[PDB]
Amino acid sequence: CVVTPVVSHALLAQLQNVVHEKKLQCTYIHHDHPASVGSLVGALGGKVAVLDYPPPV
Amino acid sequence: LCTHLSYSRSLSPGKAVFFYKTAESDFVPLRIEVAKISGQKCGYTEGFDANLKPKNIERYELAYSNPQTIEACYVPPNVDELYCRFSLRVEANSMRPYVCSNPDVLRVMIGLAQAYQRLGGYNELARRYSANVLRGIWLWRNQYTQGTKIEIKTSLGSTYHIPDARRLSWSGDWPELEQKQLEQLTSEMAKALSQPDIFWFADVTASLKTGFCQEIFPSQKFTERPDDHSVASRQLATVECSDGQLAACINPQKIGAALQKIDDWWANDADLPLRVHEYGANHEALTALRHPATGQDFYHLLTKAEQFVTVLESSEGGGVELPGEVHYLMAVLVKGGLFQKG
Amino acid sequence: YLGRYSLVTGKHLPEPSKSADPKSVSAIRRPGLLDGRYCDLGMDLIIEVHIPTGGSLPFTTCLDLLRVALP
Amino acid sequence: GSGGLELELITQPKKMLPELMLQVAGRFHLELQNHSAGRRFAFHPALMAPIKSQILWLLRQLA
DNA sequence: AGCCACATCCCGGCACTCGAAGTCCCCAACTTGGATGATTTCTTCCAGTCCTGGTAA
DNA sequence: TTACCTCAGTGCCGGGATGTGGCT
Q: Do C5 and A54 touch (CB under 8 A)?
A: yes
Q: Which residues of C fall within a CB distance of 8 Å from B281?
A: 16, 28
Delimit the domains of chain B by residue range.
1-9+93-121+261-342, 10-30+73-92+122-219
Q: Strand E closer than 7 Å to the CB of A21?
A: no
Which secondary structure element, helix H or strand E, spans residue D9, and what is its range? Answer: helix D5-11
N- to C-terminal Cα separation, chain B: 5
Sequence-distant (6+) residues with CB within 8 A of A27 are: A49, A50, A52
* Gap between the Cα atoms of B274 and B252, Å rounded: 19
For every residue of B237-252, DSSP letters joined together read -EEE-TTS-EEEEE-H
Q: Which residues of B fall within a CB distance of 8 Å from C27?
A: 286-287
A·C CB contacts under 8 A: 13
Q: Do C2 and A30 touch (CB under 8 A)?
A: no
Beta strands in B210-341 (DSSP E): 238-240, 246-250, 261-263, 274-275, 281-282, 287-288
* Gap between the Cα atoms of B304 and B61, Å rounded: 64
Whether the CB-CB separation of B264 and B273 falls below 8 Å is answered with yes
* Gap between the Cα atoms of B288 and B126, Å rounded: 26
Strand E nucleotides below 7 A of a protein CB?
A: 18, 45-54
Amino acid type, C24: S
Q: What sign does the dihedral A29-A32-A33-A36 (CA atoms) show?
A: negative
Burial of D38 (0-12, 13-18, 19+ CB in 10 A): middle
**Secondary structure of residue B236 in the 3-state scheme:** strand
Give whole-number Cα distances, B270 to B124, B263, B274, D52, in Å. 16, 8, 10, 85
**Secondary structure of residue A40 in the 3-state scheme:** helix
Q: At what angle do helices B103-117 and B305-314 cross, to 10 degrees?
A: 40
Sequence-distant (6+) residues with CB within 8 A of B318 are: B119, B120
* Gap between the Cα atoms of B133 and B325, Å rounded: 25
Whether the CB-CB separation of B93 and B197 falls below 8 Å is answered with no
Neighbours of B233 (CB within 10 A): 12
Chain B contacts in chain C segment 19-38 (CB below 8 A): 19, 22-24, 26-28
The separation, in Å, between residue A41 CA and nucleotide F2 C1' comes to 26
The separation, in Å, between residue C52 CA and nucleotide F22 C1' comes to 39
Buried b (16+ CB within 10 A) or exposed e, C37-49: eeeeeeeeeeeee
Q: Which of B22, B108, B122, B68 is nearest to B230 (CA)?
A: B68
Q: Which residues of B fall within a CB distance of 8 Å from C71?
A: none
Name the DSSP class of B75.
Answer: P
In the PDB record, what is the listed experimental method?
Answer: cryo-EM
Q: Strand F closer than 7 Å to the CB of A28?
A: no
Resolution of the structure, angstroms? 3.5
Amino acid type, B122: Y
* Gap between the Cα atoms of C42 and C3, Å rounded: 6
* Residue C4 touches chain A, beta carbons under 8 Å: yes
Q: Please, how many CA atoms are within 13 Å of residue B218, restricted to the half-sphere of its CB?
A: 29
Q: Do C4 and A57 touch (CB under 8 A)?
A: yes
- Closest nucleotide (C1' vs CA) to A36 is E54
* Gap between the Cα atoms of A51 and B11, Å rounded: 36
Whether the CB-CB separation of B1 and B342 falls below 8 Å is answered with yes
**Secondary structure of residue B126 in the 3-state scheme:** helix
Give whole-number Cα distances, B64 to B37, B39, B42, B47, B58, in Å. 13, 9, 11, 13, 12
Burial of B307 (0-12, 13-18, 19+ CB in 10 A): exposed
Amino acid type, B124: E
Strand F nucleotides below 7 A of a protein CB?
A: 5-7, 9-12
* Gap between the Cα atoms of B76 and B72, Å rounded: 13
Q: Please, how many CA atoms are within 13 Å of residue D32, restricted to the half-sphere of its CB?
A: 15
Name the DSSP class of C39.
Answer: E
Sequence-distant (6+) residues with CB within 8 A of C11 are: B222, C33, C34, C35, C36
For every residue of B1-13, DSSP letters joined together read --S-EE---SEEE
Which secondary structure element, helix H or strand E, spans residue B160, and what is its range? Answer: strand B159-162
